[model samples]
Target: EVEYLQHEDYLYRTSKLKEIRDLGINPYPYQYTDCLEVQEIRNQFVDNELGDSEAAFRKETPKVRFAGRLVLFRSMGKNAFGQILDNDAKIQVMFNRDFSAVAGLAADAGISPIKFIEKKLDLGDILGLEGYLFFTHSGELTVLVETVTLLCKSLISLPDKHAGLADKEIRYRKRWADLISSEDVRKTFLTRSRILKLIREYMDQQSFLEVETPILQTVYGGAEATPFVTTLQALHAEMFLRISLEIALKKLLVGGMSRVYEIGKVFRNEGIDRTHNPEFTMIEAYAAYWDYNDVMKCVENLVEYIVRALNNGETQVQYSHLKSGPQVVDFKAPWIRMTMKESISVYGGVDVDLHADHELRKILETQTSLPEKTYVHASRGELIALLFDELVCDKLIAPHHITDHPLETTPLCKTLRSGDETLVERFESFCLGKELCNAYSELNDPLQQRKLLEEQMRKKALNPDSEYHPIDEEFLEALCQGMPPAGGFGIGIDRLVMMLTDAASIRDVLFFPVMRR
Candidate 1:
């Protein structure tokens, strides 16, 4: 309240709060109902058979009531014209000083309805408009607002429209301001919701049961990453926010649930980047009796379904800022597949098998940005991984299944069916130079599983980079109880939304992306 006095605008707005109350208006009303979505009002005209593209001559047009923010307004003598925004859509609203009634207007109130609007209301104020639909003489869709109510009298003015919320840091930090100030910002989040709905629709159609698992776990082991620790007061013990949905979803497969998926927040106690956030949404799906090949097809079809659903059955996503030429990438079936070693050769122009471990290390040293600590004394397979990261990943601007990663990548994926001892049946789909998802022919042999988990634990002690944490014996016990052969995949929902929405940074698609205070 003290800070409210600092600005002339804030002080003036606060003064009106008393004026509104004196006029018998709540200003902050309890409720308003019987309203339609602004989109619904727009849709009524979209396919109407009405001719002349004319404004309805009288009150015969369908009546619609709705609430929105007072985003724009202008006064023309006795008539006022404005636009109110709701649900990411805006509609023109008009007021006739003699005809339009402002809520709580009184004959003795000493202020005319239009005068109240011109002087009392601010751009950021929440408004409810009850009116009839029409196309103005200029063929502009509008609502001849019969009544307008002050739902909320905002104190803070909206950001300057010409300059916009130009500071990216402030925009991300104050998302509400950004959403109100920018149409594209609001649309990005709206599309994100639609994308999630489509994903659930696809998974549900594929007979995958959407399940909820605990966010807090006693032992976390689905992926190799540090976990955000918390104290469970009732249990009087330490717990970790889940870093992955894999283990619990797999335990469900062992329970005979067959196929399952979870879309939830996963916390990684790590740093952030253009693509990485400390806390993010992940959708992990597992299907019993399926292999990596099946999961690959599922991934393609799922994305294709979403892309086409949103783009009028078009498979091509016209992505930009890609390393690959001709920026159209079709998410349709049979995406290009290449082994990691082959990609190194094709993109790096160096045969991985042709190089000794020391030679690979020497090549990685030239990357310059990577700390020597990232690759010093790294395994031969990890060296190959470093080479692919440096040379091949970004060149895969089109969708490519870079498959058969080194076994050291994760202990959860099965060894290649080709009896290749050092490579696992794992593949990552890369587009726009970023990995969109990871899939695997899941490891099921408990005896071999124990060996890898133990080895992973040992490596975890030696290297923080290893995807190793305390083994969850509960998951292992369930596996020993005969988990079926399965295929599983995990994808970052935010990144998916970012790609589909053509958002540049991972932060754009997230409504409240992690930010420093």
Candidate 2:
């Protein structure tokens, strides 16, 4: 039971550390060479094919040396059983006093080092081990310790294992401790990497060139979110962290890159929730001369490819949170596609188009507790969107692409192919009530583009706190240079991993998700 220690424990540990220092031992060593990983050593010498303990002394599979933090320890007079953690892997170590003496480990040991290990070191201390690989009677891989070195002596004890980290907020605050203690949290991050790698591989096979654009920009445009402001000391100017990667990637298309993609971080100064993080990884790409229709087919194929690659050829995966009713998502091709208006009717059960602006305003006033900053005297289409967000977003529990958003929703997408001036050629992919991807056809008409951006700026000026953005004249100039009409897409890689890997919260997948100090 690892209870919170009083001041006495700190004083005791500090005194022990001083005693070890006076005895000529450095509790935190400068370096330790880790020659072989735990898994590699286990696989190479599992059976001790050379012979038993006596013959193992003559010719053992060359001893494997590694260093890690000692997490579990059991003492038996002159012998011990313990577990050491090396990043994501854990290996069992067997320390025998007889073996240590024969291997010349105690040759230079005075009172300092041995006393430090016995008294000063705590549960999280990082210890170095040099040993030969062998198996116990239970067939578990064990390292027979030849030499032991104290790498880093930890001051504080870890959280109690059984009770776990009780506070949900604290889990995000002390993520490193959670990572060290919980295997599930570690596995989610591993799965996050696999998700990214799989997406990159899929894009590579489709001839997409991976590219990087500036995160700090003079003008922040592309999406309808506020950006984080920072000062650049060298330039003697203020800059904004990009809210979206759309405008810059489109500029690359104007420069004659056929297909370009970037998998990097973007900042959105927005509300934090179970699904949203302040800074997140986005996979945004633009392929020239392609429309939303082309983008739809590509998205379907790419998602199917990633699902199969990560799930090992399985199309169906179950998420745990929505499991009260037990929902299963299948990423098999030909996912259901619906227009945004149609979704509002089917899911929200309201004929959104029939409602007037005043009628919808009354509904919003009743349904939402949003602050005055987010309120707008919007058109019918905009009200339908507001209602959809309030009522429809959480009900989408399967893989589908919802398409044909109203013009009020965004200005960067081309007009719908159906010749509807009210709707744009935009599609958002959803699975389990959250947006996984957003894609559209590029709006390359410079005249129309500038007019829309100007309107957006005018709206921002009215509600500066809710939606404000500076216009990027450079992006407008790129539009005048005749950018090819292309397919553009962005995926929230963290949310995608959460769904695919069955993690419950955004913190489960993020190594260090943001938290209040």
Candidate 3:
């Protein structure tokens, strides 16, 4: 490994490090106890009356102790000014040559307080301050320092203050740098945390029990996606990282848990894009005795609850995605609901019942980039799915619950009750030209489930590069033990955060997205 201490900036800071130690001061301290967050100080003292002049204010000022990273610094001959940031808040602190005192410095140490701070201290250094609160000449809230302790001596300087950590690649790669230099970046993550907290609160309020499942599985069979494979040396067998929370949560239903949910990481071996990551957070919930209609209401209610909680009861949100500029999306309940065939006719300009199988294939070949083999071998249901993907999905700019998808889309969903055996009771929610949530009336027939798994296994053998959805006989056995009639839902938490925060890409919402080595 290359030693970063050999860099020029590192060398300069190291020289200052030696000087700090020469005064018998420890640059890295063990603890700070009498610390107040910057926001607390601001809230209590910002509106309080104090004297106008420095000397007058000093007489009646309240003493306080705080710690934060030094973000801004300015030096004058006798006095200096700087700002310290903590808890996403900043407060100005002033250092004076004659008035300020150093707590631990010896009387004969030969270090002048003002000169030492101005010359030795650099930006990005963590500092603890014992000070009195006052107002500066410009009426800015200020802290008059009585004591200063170096908490941490940073080796490298922070990114350029005004220009900021703007390179997208570098920002994603070095999140620490990005966070230090950008307040907006910090706020975005705080919002993400709040969103998650609100989600848990809503789930708990609705009487849903949060649960955990194994991340490493002997066989992965939930969604139609490729799994990330790994080897267990002790067992001498290959295992797969979970691609969805569906299968295990359903097993819980078989085990007689009425309501279950999990917010956890799922890995998929797939391509990365603005909206897709190799690993991401997903929230999946299953409720026994409920159907797709019940799941749709639950989803809308949960989303509305989150939006109202975050936006102060506002239902409208501003969102944008690839090639689509900013637009307002309303999350109020009863979002536009339509069947797959209806959506195809309304948005895709095609009627499925009127066209022959070969005619639909011909249209797909002409209008879409789908492979010839895909269209040639595609059944009517498969052709409908492809047509919806190519034409109808992007037109759903507002909240929509697209329902009654083709049975060919997934083997895990229950067929429709209205004798449309070709369609399943599934709905996928969409907004801002991207899919957000997927739900279904889960299949519970053991015989039908076994047949579907066998068919999926046959399809996998025929096309190896398509979603490597291996059949899990263990999951099949669980189904045979009698799972309940239930409704299940899964939502991409990252994309939801992106929409709520108006972030253009998934990377903007994620604290640490996957990056190239």
Candidate 4:
């Protein structure tokens, strides 16, 4: 596999390499050390008082040492011009037959270093240089060469620089090359790190203890998603990669831990798209003796914290080209909140006060793209929930909590304390027209919880499209043993990174997202 050439460019480079090997020159070496990083040297001494004019910079200048990849080179009789890349940053190097330390290389190495440049030093070769670093006459930073070491030789030429790899699919497939060659791709990863770091800081400030849970579970019970199954060799039993961190964290609540959060990977046997990935990271937290209202306050503050950190304590971020319009989303304190019905009325221009189920369903069937069976089988509350999802979600392009979802929308939340049967104390935050955070007043009643889970299981079994998750009797028994009435929240960490970093896809944030063979 290593010997076979997959591309014509590789084959051509391989042939040249063979010729160089026959000439008694080693193509690859163990290693080389550098005195400074390209950026460090650039920032510290590039504008030193060595020269006031361009002419002075190009003169036989101050001695410096650095190492990088030999990117470009040109030989003109006695002197040569070349460029080297270090840590993805490019710098120029100048070599002269008289000054360069090419002794004992070969009989004609000093006079004809340029002859071997194109053949032996192919694109992607790592090189070491002992040279003087200074700005050239053209004001570009250049090095005057003293010594050169062939750190590693490439058996292949890089893809064309002018006509970069145009296929995005291939780019994703070869992410390492993309990251090394694409400046924007490297910056995206940097921003991704910043986002995660900010999240960790915010949670720590809020007294939330960062925790980890098992990825493989005997029973997958958390969110309503199909889990990826795996076999446990030790027990010879079937296991599942957890679909969400909800269940395990709740068990911790029963174990007497408070203010716990986990940033973890969850897997789902689901379709992939711009928004969906089979495996993704999520941060879920549960705080003891708190309600959904408390969670809402915490979430708003956390987002405000992130926005401030990014904008030097400012609330609004100038997110470029998010949605069709609105380059900014204000994450200031006290974001707007409304009931599901109110949001529907505010955004969708539909007043549920006068409209009956049949009337609303008819209007939604025409205006929205929901299937007819969605309305036919769903209860009035369920249909209204579905219609709200279709119409109101995308309209919330700014940072706001769309709270008070219908009771029928989920089975894990506690109903409002005021005895309102139509709505539960649940909210899902939206920004960039996507769901970022979900929170709830967790249901702790043992009997009621059992009923809800059983009902959900029944519905799942009846609906071919839904996942029939088995009931966790252990969790129910724990609830019966008495757990705290807590507030729980889940933030899709990858989605948060995407929004904050302006990443085009979740894969950009993930170091190595799931990909096909």
Top lDDT prediction, candidate number: 3
Residue pairs whose backbone atoms clash in candidate 1: 224-467
Which is better, 1 or 3, measured by TM-score?
3
lDDT of 2 by residue, 1-517 (tens): 5354555666666666766565555877678775567666666666545333333344373677887888898777766678998868888877665564222224465633333345556677777788666656666677777777777767766655764345545767777777787788878788778878889889999899999999998888777777899999999999999998998899899999999999999999988888888998888989998888788889888888888887779989988787447678899988889888888788877677787777677767877775543446676667777877877788888887999988888989888877998889999989999888899898999998888888877866876366556578888899888899899988888888888888888767787888764
| N/CA/C clash count, model 1 | 1
Each prediction's TM-score versus the true structure = 0.94, 0.88, 0.95, 0.89
Over 140-243, each residue of candidate 3 has an lDDT whose tens digit, in order, gives 88888888888898988887656533565767877887788888889889999999999899889878899999999897867877889999999999999999
Kindly indicate the candidate among 1 and 2 with the higher lDDT: 1
- The C-alpha stretches of model 1 lying farther than 4 A from their native spots are 1-5, 46-58, 162-166, 321-326, 366-373, 464-468
Of 1 and 4, the candidate ahead on TM-score is 1
Model 4 C-alpha lDDT per residue in residues 207-241, reported as the tens digit of each score: 88999999988998668678889999999999999
Q: In candidate 2, which residue ranges exceed 4 Å CA deviation?
A: 1-6, 21-24, 45-62, 101-122, 163-168, 323-326, 351-377, 458-470
Encode model 1's per-residue lDDT on 323-361: one tens digit a residue: 444377788877888999999999888798988998888
lDDT of 4: 0.78
Per lDDT, what order, best first? 3, 1, 2, 4
